[PDB]
Design a protein around this nucleic acid. Structure first.
Ligand SMILES: [K+]
Length: 144
DNA sequence: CCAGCGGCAGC
DNA sequence: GCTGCGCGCTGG
């Protein structure tokens, strides 16, 4: 089974990879928002909405109240509910096919959730740091 | 003090 | 191709 390695850069994707919905929600939380502020709120969100199954039933106004100190709160609250609906009920191969996930979320999924990191060409700086480091260290970490 | 900064959809 | 969304943190 593909386990992405921990890096000296401590991307939150390294800990969330096991649950692709939670990883992708985290990428949404990090859209133009510092991890220092977003990630504490992420845990409160996941306490209230532990799964896509329940998040797709949420009132976006309740989600936006949680997102308020992060900015982009009405936008992302509506995104999270629709994303969670499509994640479960739309046929998809890569999550870029889903509302709210672009290249950054998709590259994140393809590096962390599935074993496709060698095919990914990130433009995100933090993904580039992790991905460059992976190419330089994957042999030492005994990964293919 | 406060401008700059930490993705995505819809055009 | 550009713009709206958007708070709190950063640092001279
Ligand atoms: K998409």
């Amino acid at each position: 089974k593909w386990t992405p390695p921990r890096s000296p850069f401590n991307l939150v994707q390294e800990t969330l990879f096991h649950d692709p919905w939670k990883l992708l929600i985290a990428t949404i939380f990090l859209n133009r928002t510092s991890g220092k502020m977003a990630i504490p709120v992420l845990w409160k969100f996941l306490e209230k909405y532990p799964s896509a199954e329940v998040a797709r039933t949420a009132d976006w106004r309740d989600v936006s109240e949680l997102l308020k100190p992060l900015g982009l709160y009405d936008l992302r609250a509506k995104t999270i509910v629709k994303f969670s609906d499509e994640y479960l009920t739309k046929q998809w191969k890569y999550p870029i096919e889903l509302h709210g996930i672009g290249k950054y979320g998709n590259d994140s999924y393809r590096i962390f959730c599935v074993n496709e990191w060698k095919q990914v060409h990130p433009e995100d700086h933090k993904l580039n740091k992790y991905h460059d480091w992976l190419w330089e260290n994957h042999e030492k970490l005994s990964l293919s």
